[PDB]
Design a protein around this ligand. Sequence first.
Ligand SMILES: Nc1ncnc2c1ncn2[C@@H]1O[C@H](COP(=O)(O)OP(=O)(O)O)[C@@H](O)[C@H]1O
Ligand SMILES: [Mg+2]
Lengths: 754, 788
Amino acid sequence: MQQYLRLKAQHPEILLFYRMGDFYELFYDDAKRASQLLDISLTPMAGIPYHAVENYLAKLVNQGESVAICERKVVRIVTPGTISDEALLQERQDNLLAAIWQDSKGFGYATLDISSGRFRLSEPADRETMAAELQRTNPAELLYAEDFAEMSLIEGRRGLRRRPLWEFEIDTARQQLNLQFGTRDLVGFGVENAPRGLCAAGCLLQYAKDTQRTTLPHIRSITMEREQDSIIMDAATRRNLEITQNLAGGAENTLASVLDCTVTPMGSRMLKRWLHMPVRDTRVLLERQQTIGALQDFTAGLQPVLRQVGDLERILARLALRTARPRDLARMRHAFQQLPELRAQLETVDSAPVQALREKMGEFAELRDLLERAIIDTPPVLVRDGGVIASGYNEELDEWRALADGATDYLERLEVRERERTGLDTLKVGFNAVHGYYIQISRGQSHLAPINYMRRQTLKNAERYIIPELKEYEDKVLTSKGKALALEKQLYEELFDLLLPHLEALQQSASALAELDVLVNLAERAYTLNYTCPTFIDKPGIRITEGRHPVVEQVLNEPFIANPLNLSPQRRMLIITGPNMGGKSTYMRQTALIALMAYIGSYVPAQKVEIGPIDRIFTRVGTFMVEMTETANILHNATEYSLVLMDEIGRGTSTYDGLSLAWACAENLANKIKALTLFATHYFELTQLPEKMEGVANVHLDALEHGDTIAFMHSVQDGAASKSYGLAVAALAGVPKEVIKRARQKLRELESIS
Amino acid sequence: SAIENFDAHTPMMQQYLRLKAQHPEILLFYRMGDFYELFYDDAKRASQLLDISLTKRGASAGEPIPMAGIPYHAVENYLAKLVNQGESVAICEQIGDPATSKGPVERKVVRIVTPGTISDEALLQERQDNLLAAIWQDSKGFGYATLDISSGRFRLSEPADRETMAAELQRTNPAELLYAEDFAEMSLIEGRRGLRRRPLWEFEIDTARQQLNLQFGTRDLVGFGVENAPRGLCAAGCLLQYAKDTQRTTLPHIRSITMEREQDSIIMDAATRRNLEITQNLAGGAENTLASVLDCTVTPMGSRMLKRWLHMPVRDTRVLLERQQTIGALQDFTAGLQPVLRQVGDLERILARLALRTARPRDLARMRHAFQQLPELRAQLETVDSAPVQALREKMGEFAELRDLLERAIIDTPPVLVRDGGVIASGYNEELDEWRALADGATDYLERLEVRERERTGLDTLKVGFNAVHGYYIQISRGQSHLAPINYMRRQTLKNAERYIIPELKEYEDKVLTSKGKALALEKQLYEELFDLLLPHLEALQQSASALAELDVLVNLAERAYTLNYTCPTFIDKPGIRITEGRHPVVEQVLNEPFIANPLNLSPQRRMLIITGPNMGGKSTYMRQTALIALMAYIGSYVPAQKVEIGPIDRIFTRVGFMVEMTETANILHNATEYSLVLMDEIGRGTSTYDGLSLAWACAENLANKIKALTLFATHYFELTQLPEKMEGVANVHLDALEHGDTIAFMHSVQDGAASKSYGLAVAALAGVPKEVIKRARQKLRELESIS
DNA sequence: AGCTGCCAGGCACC
DNA sequence: GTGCCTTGGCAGCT
Ligand SMILES: Nc1ncnc2c1ncn2[C@@H]1O[C@H](COP(=O)(O)OP(=O)(O)O)[C@@H](O)[C@H]1O
Ligand SMILES: [Mg+2]
């Protein structure tokens, strides 16, 4: 046990699994942390069983831990961002490697999805935009230059990896990026004039390659994510809208929960991506809109077939890495068989892009016929033990099998020859690695074992023998079965050689199939959930009719209530007064969301939506300090094409400081920024604003008082709120009648003064 | 779908289905030979829960039988897994003797492991209580009972309202909760772990009394002062009935019950406990809580007690003074006692296993070891001049006789279990010394017979060996196996060697095996004999463990008082709190800068402080420390300040800033009295400007003028600084700030009077709100300031 | 030292 | 009097 320490040197910053029998023990500083992650005991030992390493691996890997197995030297290493095995990955969630680094000018960024090969790079200018990306992409592993200054950005992130500065040298990166894609220059990818980003990308690429020690011919390109291309959404806005992850960490009662009725895992992952990346370019959208409406009818017929395609993206990765297993080629073939049925259905769909996805989807006939002949219906998990290549694929194999089988058949009749020529009904042939083939007599019966029988193993209640004949046909079995196992593997490896030259076209199929899933889904959702198609206008504005919060309406078993909205440049800002109770917050969020969805190509929960160009979405809807910091970022960055949602700011400090801060903020967003604003507030004094400045208007929520409770409504109406309900609720909440009456007195006296 | 009427099943599955029908909701481990097995549904679940194979074993009444199992020897790993996910398991054992059992061997469920009744070292946590509990509801209140099965501690109580009941669940935090079937307030109990719905009949009062009396050996419950408390007794009844059915043995360590009266201790509510971070930080960890800072006990049974104390402050002026006196006398003796007190270990829980006849060999060895530290504890404490200390030196006994029993009965370091022997020592039982010796002829015998047979046969590969399946043997290699004596009877064959047996050896096989088993049965008989010798003293032993735990706690609090610099507070007759240079006992450690200590004078004439101050000024911390100083004072501990005078305090309320705030606040208005300490922390929420301020006003008014509680009222509303003007008993304090220059500065120092101003704009400016906007908010502020 | 597979002891069934 | 079967232990082969 002294050979562990000297070989920990090899990899210091990584957990070292070490083999001791049927477990993988861990020592020293590494056991404390490994028991503190996986729920096991520390003795400084700690270890796991062999037929479950791949869970106590997938689970350290989930928490940003690279791992290193040790069998004698380090044989396997995994890292959070570089895995591609279906056991280690979560079915419907991206898993990225990222690299980040820092010039004096600003930041360079690069994400890799090792499975899809989806390789993106960006170049955030300021602090908070680098922060917004770290949020959105959620790298499972973060490479960062040692010299990286602003660590408060990535300080507590899981699976951080400090790397030398020289891995972010521009010309080493350029070469290696160009060698990877097979080009002279990266101009065809739109990135040659973007050196910061390319550094991030060169370092990342460098490292991926290392973790794999193979080519990665699925990584054939790179794209850059320009700022002006997307509607920008700060981390806080992403979180408040609950796009994929609800505020409480989970994933239900979220926008994706409602909108994500895709059937392939690769399509779930793509939908979620789109949802986090609304694009400002109406082109791509207007085209998405029209695709989505075309497949309205063809939904029922398409999805159940599309479901059979499966996760063809991730399978295509294990083909590239050459790790793909029997069941993976089997799932690849099953998908090819779907392609013709799908092609038949998209034939009629009159939409130039739907027809493009059918072209891009491919058919792949050779390959479908190839694996139809070369694999059985349902092979076993691994090639390891043969029985995967179908009978009739290759004369030679079949011959070697028929040989083995005729030795099995002999040995069965030998079981019946000896049973007859002994009169002993517990006789039987068996197989075992210890002894090879063997006859076996029960213990009570074993003394009548014929004199030619040679004994070999005394068991508790039986005895085992061998004879020249028996051993001679073992020879026959072992020979055949073994030669034919070696053939299956060679035959199976050749299936890789024939499949790989079409890797390019296949990636394109999975991707076309992936988009087809998403759009077919968005089409079904649009139809089922009574969404309408939003139209786009030139000036900034949001005109909604009977619109809704897409999640709240699916979740609550009370009726939703639909509200209008009418923001234009002549009506930029609504001062929303009245009680809150979620109602005001909902009216706002359904706005952010209806816009988000519009600007993703989806249909929207409303009788009608007109909408202008939006560049950022801000949603302070959630210390006083946080509130003000968030409010600061909004005032510093809103343009007049921003959508800005603000929730009773002022609460938390003094009547007058807050009244004043809120007044000063509304003035600023309405006269200076001129951004389209919903300004929830409680200050009644703010309702004078419409008189004191153009382009502000008053709207409100109200409540009905019946019986023994109070109906907090959901319905926005013109003008200011002429009532308050805090005392109303104090009453229903059990506060002594006399106290309430004293508060009511205090109320009429404080208000009267204003 | 098959009809599975009794007589369609096999004799075995009949026996199973009968026992299983007595445990329909919980897994049944079913001893079948060497394996605990599980069938149907149970197997399906067990398979999912414990990750084990789901298989089949021969249909019974037409349909096949799902099956899952685990060998008997690995049962406790799996009992651990299940108990940790709040699952009960009924253990069914074999009672009979299959060699004289015609049908299936008799089978009785002998125990039931449930999360509130575990008493094994490996299933529990050393520094953390594990309570069973029962709750039930009357038309007019709440009955409630708790057992700590591994010490016998058995309390009962009767909370008057929803919020006190919510306080009591939070405080006690039962791993398991039996609750009556007709319980109304599922808000309290839904979503707790180990929830157990029980039928009304178990909470019937005459039955509770019957059982409880019978367990305690009494005609009535008058001497436990609970004969008065049928609301709570009904809980006890249902608790006990349950314990008995889990354990299925006597429970001699459950000898009394004790009421927890409302007046006997400072009642704090959900909010207050959460917000004082007594044992749980505000995220859920234990890092940096009261208990983290104060808990340097050396035994686990002591760490647990300090935590019950911290959680239930006592209002007995006499218990408190005796406690302070102890922390005083013992201050010099902490360095010597603690290293000795540590070796006592967790005797509390050992005596639990002793009560249940469960204790293992290493349990008795550590009981012996504890006994061995008593004479040195009696020395160290004799010289200490303090009667309370001397009554603990007294109560902790010495136990010279039982110590000499374990020293003669058991070897120094025995194995974990009795099941293989090697526990009882030489000299204790002469019949065992005799049986051991006949069994250990190996010292040179099999070696001698081996060597003499190798020379007689001339067959160098000849070895003697035992293998568990075929007994002893003489082995010969296959090269030489045809040359072996004709006398050698072939016994076991192998690939390259052939083992034989002869009379001389088969006879030594028998001499050895019957004697080894005779010696194990007798040893197991001697071991269980230890329990009957010890058990008679169980009561005086329990009183010892308690003594040593309390000593651990006090010796601790003494050391804590020295190293952290605390002073004995004094108590007074009327309500009031008077702190000179006092600190938050916790936050003055996590901080790597000196803690700005602060004063406080609360009296019946100066009983509400409106507390203003900027955000992050130190307001919440000022209130938190006030309650922790009151909290520590009322456990007998020394306190984090220079001087403290504190009056009686019945209850502590906390509100920290919808329909929930309103209710919480109403509870404070209904149950607060002159003797309560109330912390409103920035309350008052409305749907308009002056909505919520109005309520805070009326609430502050009502608290000052009608309730007359002691009150720390932190506030953002400057409107409330006018309260002293109008209200009697109300005064303004503030946490100082220096805008002075352009920046902030939090001086963290409480001062008299209203604050100079609110700092909202300055704090907004510090957040990075653009200057042009702060400039215009100020233009607006001077607008609003001009009204008055 | 590593991998394979008999064995533990109940009871049902032929 | 052989059948059948969980999991963990370690014997019996390399
Ligand atoms: N007496 C003090 N001395 C030094 N630091 C303090 C003191 N009181 C509070 N603080 C620090 O200031 C922080 C914020 O204090 P806090 O009580 O929350 O102010 P407020 O409640 O008014 O918002 C605390 O977490 C603590 O670290
Ligand atoms: Mg505070």
